[PDB]
Symmetry: C4
Subunit: 256 residues, 4 copies
């Protein structure tokens, strides 16, 4: 269909909302939750069918050729472009993956793969690129907004992994972990696997946002080797991200 189709824009925004949800919830699902409770099952079904329908619509939509100004309309050409660009990855990240893990003898390697659903963030960067090409905004403000969104997103998906790393150890050796050795005030996170989900998520995101901003109170810190190797990796990338953010903001201020 014509890219300028007015309902196609509404479909794009709907898919954007679903992609935002599926990129903010996938790291939580791999992390805090293990084998999702039966309540959120319908959410999984709805998301997967919605993204499959998006795949079909992409298969049935016309595109603008990049070599020259030529809005092509031949179905085979768009089919080759889609199949060669990213069609395989999205389809692989479209099968219900929780179901496979829950069926095939609860194997952790299967659950180690819903990370591939992170490819849905391509929709978000697509929207950022579209907003850039709009002349209403400036070249740099789009870059700063994109950089800030990426920093905030990597912070949440780093908090999720940082909590996950606490579940790798057996639940007898829980004292030798970032959570389970925590003692804030008069509250001890002894059996952290049994606390409310939101308490654990807030505790794990506290650590991530007092490091992405380089405050580091030190009330929550890595205790194992896995967690140390993860913290050094996280900070060595957040530093470059923050440097880029500061550089872009300064460039916006200088260009006037």
């Amino acid at each position: 269909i014509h890219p300028k189709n007015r309902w196609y824009k509404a479909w794009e925004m709907f898919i954007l909302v679903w992609a935002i949800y599926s990129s903010l919830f996938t790291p939580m699902e791999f992390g805090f939750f293990r084998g999702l409770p039966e309540r959120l099952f319908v959410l999984d079904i709805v998301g997967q069918i919605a993204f499959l329908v998006d795949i079909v619509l992409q298969f049935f939509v016309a595109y603008r050729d990049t070599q020259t100004y030529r809005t092509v309309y031949k179905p085979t050409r768009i089919a080759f472009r889609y199949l060669k660009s990213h069609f395989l990855m999205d389809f692989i990240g479209c099968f219900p993956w929780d179901l496979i893990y829950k069926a095939s003898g609860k194997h952790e390697l299967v659950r180690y793969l819903l990370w591939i659903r992170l490819f849905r963030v391509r929709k978000v960067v697509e929207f950022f690129q579209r907003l850039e090409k709009d002349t209403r905004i400036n070249y740099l403000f789009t870059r700063i907004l994109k950089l800030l969104f990426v920093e905030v997103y990597c912070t949440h998906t780093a908090a999720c992994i940082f909590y996950y790393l606490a579940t790798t150890l057996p639940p007898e050796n829980e004292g030798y972990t970032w959570i389970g050795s925590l003692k804030l005030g008069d509250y001890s996170y002894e059996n952290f696997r049994e606390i409310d989900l939101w308490k654990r998520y807030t505790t794990a995101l506290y650590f991530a946002i007092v490091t992405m901003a380089t405050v580091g109170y030190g009330d929550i810190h890595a205790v194992n080797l896995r967690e140390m190797i993860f913290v050094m990796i996280y900070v060595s990338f957040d530093m470059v991200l923050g440097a880029y953010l500061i550089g872009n903001i300064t460039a916006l201020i200088v260009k006037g």
Copy 2:
């Protein structure tokens, strides 16, 4: 009355001092104090009548039209301008609000409303923009001064809220709070509701200025969920504020 009235400058500078006081004391009043002691009774009344006199004077004063260079004088449209722009908010933030709370069965929701007095910082930013207009100072130095004042002000108004959040919990569950769990040296902040006001304010502002500068010693930290959700919100905004400040300073140096 003409804007160039020489006593009008004196009135503006006097209202500026009152606005500074009412913007640096409102978060303290919502925070550390609860139902202001009888000693400070007269100060509230004096401030409210002073700001009401400012309101009526703003009603009876000429303005400069923004569409074109016209120093207009006709009262009806100056009245309409005042009414639509900000007349409602200042008047709502002009009623004695401590009195209403102390009368109507000490309801916390009433006390949750003096935050509306923060609109008086409009006078401060008005002065900053006026100094921006003056050719005595540069375009960027005004921006750096404004950004530094906003950072320092939000730090104090964040310290006040951070202390307040420790008073939401009942005073039996006092050991699970940012304060009351503190132990500095050989001094334990056990009954923090009973310590001298200035000790509590200094302790709470210490935390705010060792996070606004991103030092984070870690001797004072969030312990509850409210306090964590507040610290993550505070740092995620102070980071952007500091990035903007650094960018503006760098731009001033570059264009220098």
Copy 3:
């Protein structure tokens, strides 16, 4: 004498070295030491007579007028300049001030005044100006070097005051202090007034350089109200200093 007197350069560098010593040792003398031991007495005498000889030499030197290019040689005007500019402040900070304190009943207010010797840092500032006007170097590199020297100097003079603030409290109430409540490893700084001078200086400068760089480990922190009010003042100025340093470095890189 002629400003281009070749031995006058040697005298200027000699005075510069003495100014370095007297600006890096005055805060230590006000701080860690109280009523200097008899050993360093000759050092005090030599320093004061050296600066008095500098006073008389500057009284007996010619200058170049600032209103226009006029190397004036008339004694009355060259005397009037130094009389009105800084003769008083350089001379009050030239009397032996330790002797007065040790004589007049060991009064602390007298010892609270050798801070006036810090005006000798204007010699270092003038040296930086001399390096600036020289075309051998760039305009910005001089600024970055000056900024880095000021940052490092204020760090040492902040460490000295931070240790001094620990001596204001009586030596019974010593546990309620940043030092005396310290416990690093298995070493407890119990009687901190009796430890070796260099241990105390290194401990106090550790804190200053892990805050001037905004690291803040948190092993050393303010415990009283004096120390908190001092730390908030120190960080709120080191932040601006670091922002200025980063801006100047970025400007040098950009203009390069």
Copy 4:
């Protein structure tokens, strides 16, 4: 031999890998290891003969004269260039130094000399300069990459020294040290000289990466005087390195 020799490029890239290994392993060898185990015997010999072969090949390679565009070819002047340039240091840092220490009655001063092998990073900066002159990449991206590599390298070589400083103290006075006084979770680093090599390296690099990024959790900190004097030196240089990195990134962003 003509510098444009195609096998000479392969030899240069091979010596580059060896230089990477010898610059990332020398600080570890001076640090964590003391008198390398017999297993790693062959690696040292292979490296030293490889660098000796590089030295003789440099003695038998043609070079480009810097005064004018002249690809000289006469062996005497290439020999003079080598001898006057950095050749003695390469030879001194080519003798097996572990062997000398293990033979000459295990004297620590001999082991204090393999630091001279750090001159091999000259090959890495040679490659960075070659990449700079290649027009494929920009002038600033080369500088940012070089700055980031230097920061990351100095962080590892600072972690190695920070662990080494823990071995200077006798193993009875082990509690008064940054490691050996550590207590992370329920694991106490009591006999730190007996833990696995990789645990100690990760623990010491954790500290270095959470200070090079200025996070400073405070779970690992200096306890002695040696370690404090080292931390103040490390931070006062990492700050300038980070400022330079931010400035270069900002200059790249502004340059468009």
